Amino acid sequence: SSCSEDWVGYQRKCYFISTVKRSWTSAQNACSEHGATLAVIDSEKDMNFLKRYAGREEHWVGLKKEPGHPWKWSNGKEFNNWFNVTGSDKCVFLKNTEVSSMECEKNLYWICNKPYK
Amino acid sequence: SSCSEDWVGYQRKCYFISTVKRSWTSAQNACSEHGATLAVIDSEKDMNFLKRYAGREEHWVGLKKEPGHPWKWSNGKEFNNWFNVTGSDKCVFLKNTEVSSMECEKNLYWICNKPYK
Numbered sequence A, B: 001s002s003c004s005e006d007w008v009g010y011q012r013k014c015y016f017i018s019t020v021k022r023s024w025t026s027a028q029n030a031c032s033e034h035g036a037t038l039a040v041i042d043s044e045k046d047m048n049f050l051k052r053y054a055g056r057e058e059h060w061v062g063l064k065k066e067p068g069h070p071w072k073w074s075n076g077k078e079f080n081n082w083f084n085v086t087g088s089d090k091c092v093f094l095k096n097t098e099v100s101s102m103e104c105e106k107n108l109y110w111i112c113n114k115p116y117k
Ligand SMILES: [Zn+2]
Pocket: A033, A034
């Protein structure tokens, strides 16, 4: 009802976790096909959930920055910088022990989300 | 709607993961207070989800066996033995790298579930 039975519902958002690896842009396109987007993380609850839903391997999430511009969410929303992004790259990934940046071309598993309903 | 926003919805069930450790019996009582039960795992999808929702630490789930009797789910349902339980103890736990048995008195984190709605 709230989410497809095959997606995971938590804190008013529906999540999908990939089984294959793609670059950040290709992962975002895959998310977009489901009416979703690389995961937007608005709270500590979401972050802790994702860091665990991810597992041991790095997973792309929805923060990216274009040269000379600020970090921006995958859905275009501006990032309020509620958490700090380590590293020197332009796309963000997470896994259980960390949230950091990696070259956007790297093929990683990914997580998408979209609002409930 | 389907589950409390604070619980995790997947495959028609709502999940809760503890932040503290308890014995199997005490964990089951905590689950029961929420109208839930130590997690019943009916499919490979549920199992893979739980092994990841759990993380690196062992978490009690809903399979236990009384001496001389078969493994039984925490809600009283008989176990169809769709998966094998390793070890020589009487309560089942899981984490990302395994699902096995442990002495029921051991205090572990736990996972509860209950049907959607
Ligand atoms: Zn879809």
